[PDB]
Symmetry: none
Subunit: 166 residues, 5 copies
C-alpha cells in the first residue's frame, strides 16, 4: 500500500501534463475573436463603402469594489480631450462598453486612435480602476511556460491576463 | 500521508484547468442564449416572447405573469411535468401586451402539495468574462452566471 | 496519522465528484453546434410540403430503421392520420444496424400527396422469422436536446446527425 | 459487510464510467459534425472527375519507405488513361491529386476512374495500400462504437481512417 | 461462507481488471477526440522551422502582391536581429533590420518589395536570420508559413499535413495562425 500510493501519485501528475495538450489546441478557438486586455487604446474608422458609419473598438474597466460614479475621458493623439462619458454605477468585476464615436459637440470623430482614462469612486472615495482596450487575436504562440495569444500591434499576452472574450 | 495530501493538491489543479478549458469552450456560446434562474421577461420584434422555464427534482402547475406595474396579464395551464428542466415560449382578454419587461411567478404542486420550483430565464451571450471563484459567462444586462447554473442552452 | 489521511480521502472523493459534475456540462456546450443542423430520432412522423414558388417540388422528411439482426425482407408501410395506407415500400435486404431513407412524396396511385403529416410502420424478417424493427424520425434541432414540435430528446437516443 | 459493497462499488463506478465513455462518443460526433463538410481518406482506388475538370484526391499508405513509386490510372473499361511518376515517399500516409488529364495532355471525360500503385525499394516490391476520397454526410451509431457515414461508399470506423481533409 | 467470500473476492479482482481496460478505451477516445479538434487546424496555417517565403498576385487586375509570413525562435533575447532575403538565383533582394527581440517566438510579414523600392516577381524566396546579444551571436531558428491541409495518422502519433512542406508533429509548431 505504501508503494501503491506513490505510483498512483506520479500518474495524476502525468495526466495533468496530458490535460495541458488539449488546452493548447483549445486556445485556437479564440483565433478570430477579440479580447479585453489592460490598455487604453480605442481605434476609429470608416469603411471603404459610401454612407459608411464610423465605429470604435470597444473599451472596458475592471473593478475590485463597486462605484457610484464612473467617468471616461477620451483623448486624441495630441492629448486633447474630445469627449467625456458618464457611465453609471458598477459592481466589482469586469465591464465592457462601446463609444458611439462622437465627440461632445455631437460631430463624428476622424478615423484614428484614441485613449481612455477612467475614474471610479463610491461616495467620493477613489478606487483602483484598470482600463481595458480591444485587441484582436491573430494567432496562438508557444511560450516557455505556456501558450500565448498574438494580438498583433498590441503584442503578446498570456491567457490569465484576458479579462473578457468577445 | 504525503501521497494523499499531494493527490489532493494535484487533483485540485486539475479541477482548475478543466473549468478554464470549459471557459475557452464558452466562446462557442457567444451569439446564442441560455436558461438560468430568474423571472424577467422582455419583448421586442406577430409578437414573440423571450422564453421561460421551471426545474423540478408535480401534477398541477399554474403560472402567473405580472407586469412592470404589478398587474397580472395571463396564466396558462398546459399540463403536468416530469422531473428535470422544461422551457416554453397575448393578454388574458387576447390582446397583445405592450413592449416592455414582465415577471413570472410559478406554482407547482403534487396532489395539492407544493414543491420547490425555480423559475428559469433567457439570457443572450455577448462575451465570456473571468470571475473570482471561477470564470463567468456574460449575459449582458442580466449580468454573469456560472455554467452549472445554466439549465438549458438556446 | 491515519485519521488525518481518512479526512483527506473524504476531501479527495468530494473533489473527484466535482470533476465528474463539471465534465457533464461541458459536453452540453459541445452540443450547441447541433442547433443549425438536424437529426434522426425515434418516431414515425413524416412531413410533406410545397413552396409558394413555381416549379416548387414536394419534399419529405427522411425516415429510418435500426436492426439487431440482419434481415432478408424489409417492407415499410406508410399510413396517413386516418390510418389509411397511402404507400407501401419494399426497401431490400439489410444487414444489422441503422439505415435511413427518403420517400418520394408520391402515393400508391402515383400522385403527389397533399401537405401534411404521415406515419410509418416497418416490418422486417429474416427467413420467415420475424424481427424487432425500431422506426426512426427526422427532427430539426432548436436547442440544447430540444427539437421543438417533436419535443425533447437525449443525445444517446439520437441515431444520426445530418 | 464492506466486502460485498466494494464488489458493488467497483461495479457501480463502472456503470457510471461506462456512461462516460458513451458520453465521449457523442462528443466525438459533435466534432464529427464539423467533419461532414470535408471528407476523409480510406482504403480504395476510386477517383472521380467533373466540371476546368477536377478530380477527387487519392493516396497511398506505406509500411516502409521506397525508391520507386508509380501510379497507374485506368478508366471504367479497364484501359489505362494515365501513368504517374510521383516521386519518393517515406513510410506512412501520403495524399495526391491527379490533374485529370491523360498522357496526351487532354482532359478525361467526367466519370469514375481507378488507381493502381506500385512501390519498391531497390528492386524489392513493397506492400502499398491505395487510398480514396470520400465525403462525409453524417455520423452513425454502431454496437461497439460510433461510426462514420460516407454516403455512396457506406460506413467506416475511425481507426481505419488514414487521413482527414 | 469461505466459498462465498472467495466468490466476492474474484469479482473485485475481475472488476478492477475491468475498470483499467474500460479506462483504456477512454484514454484512447481522448486521443481520437484530440484528432477531431485537430481538424480545426485544417483551415488554418502554422509557423514551422524553415526559410521559405512565397509571393503572389491574384487573378484580379490592380491586385497587390502579398507574402507568406516568416519568423524566428530564440532561446535568449537579442538586441541585433537581421533578416536577409534572397531569391532562387541567390541575389539579395532585401535586407531587414528587425531590432531587439525577447526570447521566444516572433513572426513578421514581408511587404514583398525589394531595396530599390520595386515589387518582387511572383515566386519563391528565402529568409536568413542572424541574431546576436552584445556581439555574441545566438542560435536562431528561422520559421516559415505553412498552410495545414489535413490531419494524417502516422505509426506513432497524429500528424499535420502541410502539403508541399510535408508533415509535422504538433509540438514542432511554433505558432498557429
Amino acid at each position: 500500500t505504501v508503494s501503491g500510493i506513490e505510483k498512483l501519485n506520479t500518474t495524476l501528475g502525468a495526466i495533468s501534463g496530458q490535460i495541458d495538450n488539449s488546452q493548447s489546441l483549445q486556445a485556437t478557438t479564440l483565433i478570430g475573436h477579440g479580447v479585453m486586455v489592460p490598455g487604453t487604446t480605442i481605434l476609429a474608422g470608416k469603411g471603404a463603402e459610401e454612407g459608411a458609419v464610423t465605429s470604435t473598438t470597444p473599451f472596458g474597466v475592471e473593478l475590485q469594489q463597486p462605484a457610484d460614479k464612473v467617468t471616461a475621458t477620451i483623448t486624441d493623439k495630441d492629448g486633447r480631450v474630445v469627449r467625456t462619458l458618464e457611465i453609471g454605477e458598477l459592481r466589482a468585476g469586469v465591464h465592457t462598453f462601446t463609444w458611439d464615436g462622437k465627440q461632445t459637440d455631437g460631430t463624428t470623430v476622424p478615423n484614428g486612435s484614441y485613449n481612455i482614462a477612467i475614474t471610479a469612486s463610491n461616495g467620493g472615495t477613489q478606487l483602483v480602476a484598470q482600463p481595458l482596450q480591444f485587441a484582436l487575436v491573430q494567432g496562438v504562440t508557444k511560450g516557455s511556460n505556456g501558450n500565448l495569444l498574438d494580438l498583433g500591434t498590441y503584442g503578446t499576452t498570456t491567457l490569465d491576463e484576458v479579462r473578457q472574450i468577445i
